[PDB]
Amino acid sequence: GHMTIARDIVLQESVGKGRFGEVWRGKWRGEEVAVKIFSSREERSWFREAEIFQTVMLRHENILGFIAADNKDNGTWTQLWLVTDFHEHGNLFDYLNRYTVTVEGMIKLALSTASGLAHLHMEIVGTQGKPAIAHRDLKSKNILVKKNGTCCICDFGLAVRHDSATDTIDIAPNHRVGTKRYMAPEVLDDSINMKHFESFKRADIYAMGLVFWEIARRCSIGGIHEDYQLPYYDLVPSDPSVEEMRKVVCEQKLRPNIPNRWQSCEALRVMAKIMRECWYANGAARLTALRIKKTLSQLSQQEGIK
Numbered sequence: 591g592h593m594t595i596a597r598d599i600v601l602q603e604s605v606g607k608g609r610f611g612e613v614w615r616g617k618w619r620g621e622e623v624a625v626k627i628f629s630s631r632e633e634r635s636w637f638r639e640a641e642i643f644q645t646v647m648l649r650h651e652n653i654l655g656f657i658a659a660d661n662k663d664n665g666t667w668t669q670l671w672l673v674t675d676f677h678e679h680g681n682l683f684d685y686l687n688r689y690t691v692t693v694e695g696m697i698k699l700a701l702s703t704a705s706g707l708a709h710l711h712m713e714i715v716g717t718q719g720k721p722a723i724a725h726r727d728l729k730s731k732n733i734l735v736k737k738n739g740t741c742c743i744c745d746f747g748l749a750v751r752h753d754s755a756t757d758t759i760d761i762a763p764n765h766r767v768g769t770k771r772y773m774a775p776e777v778l779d780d781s782i783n784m785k786h787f788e789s790f791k792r793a794d795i796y797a798m799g800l801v802f803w804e805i806a807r808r809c810s811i812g813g814i815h816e817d818y819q820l821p822y823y824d825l826v827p828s829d830p831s832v833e834e835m836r837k838v839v840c841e842q843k844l845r846p847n848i849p850n851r852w853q854s855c856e857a858l859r860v861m862a863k864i865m866r867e868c869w870y871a872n873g874a875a876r877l878t879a880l881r882i883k884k885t886l887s888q889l890s891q892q893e894g895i896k
Contacts, residue, residue, distance in 0.1 A: 596662040596673070598619070599617065599623060599671075599673065601616050601625060608626060609745060609748065610628060610632050611672065612627050616676075622676040623657060623675070624675065625671055625673050626671070626672040626674070627669050629669070629670070633670060636670040636672060639745075639746050642749045644656065645721065645723065646719060646720055647720035650709040652706025652742050653709065653710065653742055653743055654742045654743065654744040657673040658673040659671070659672055659673075677735060679735035679737065681732070681733060682730040682731070682733040682801070682804070683729075683804075686730065686805065686807075686818050690815050691805070693811065693893060695809070696809040697895050698895060699739070700861065701883065703741045703798065704882040707882075708879035708882070711723065711724065711791050711794070711878070711879050711880070712880065713752070721751045723749050723750070725743065725746070725749050725794050726767060727748045727768045728801065729769050729797060729800075729801065732745040748767050750787070759785075763784055765784070766780070770830055771822060772796075772797040773793075773832070774797065775840050775871040776789070776792075776873055778832055778835050778840055779840045788873075791878075791879075794879070795868050795873075795877065795878070795882075796873070798868060798882070800846065804820070804821065806852060809861075811858075814851065816849060822846060826838055840871065845869045846865075848866070856889075868882075
């Protein structure tokens with residue numbers, strides 16, 4: 591047939607894991623594809639991520655390209671597959687550990703992440719309407735770097751969708767899901783109002799601010815940059831508990847430190863200001879993803895990027 595299906599894909603190499611499922615590099619008609627495999631007992635996680643990926647009008651240059659949700663029976667058990675575009679550079683966490691970026695590179699990565707999130711967060715009204723979506727697990731490990739230097743967001747297993755007319759969320763979400771290190775203050779202290787969709791959007795913003803801090807450290811100007819670090823590397827253990835995170839973020843009220851050299855460059859000054867404005871303990875005070883996109887677009891034009 592013309593459509594991509596599991597039976598026509600050959601797995602070649604293990605390339606990591608998501609929250610649920612294992613990721614493999616596959617081959618479909620000579621072309622590289624990413625394949626996320628789930629067992630029968632993980633049917634709900636598989637189904638939920640396939641459901642998010644198939645949302646009407648979701649496709650966007652800054653959202654991971656969905657190919658197919660399929661089943662493959664090997665004759666003993668059935669694997670549940672989620673097929674997507676393959677990106678050679680892998681995730682932003684891996685890329686930032688391997689490389690430093692230029693001012694252009696940094697702005698390209700930050701702007702494309704902000705454009706992807708604003709598309710996700712924004713409702714598109716009309717006959718082929720797209721509901722507003724909150725990611726709930728944004729981190730550098732869930733952002734993939736494309737060959738052209740732009741980003742796309744992936745891993746939608748925890749995402750929530752909003753029905754604006756009836757003001758309802760498509761699933762009943764559980765407290766403190768996601769990556770503990772990137773959890774917003776209101777998530778860590780359980781004060782988040784989970785019956786208000788805007789709360790999930792604001793929590794994604796906080797996490798995006800942390801990712802921007804990760805990028806900016808790697809922005810090398812005149813061969814000077816910081817080494818790669820995860821946010822809160824200087825304050826919490828490698829695998830921090832919610833209690834360790836809450837004591838730092840909510841009680842001591844600390845945020846990742848803004849290095850003095852970021853004050854000496856306009857692009858880094860703009861990035862530093864966006865970060866602070868993502869990091870308020872109160873979500874209603876944080877910038878929106880659309881405002882961040884607008885700010886970074888203006889900065890991209892000023893520096894003549896791409």
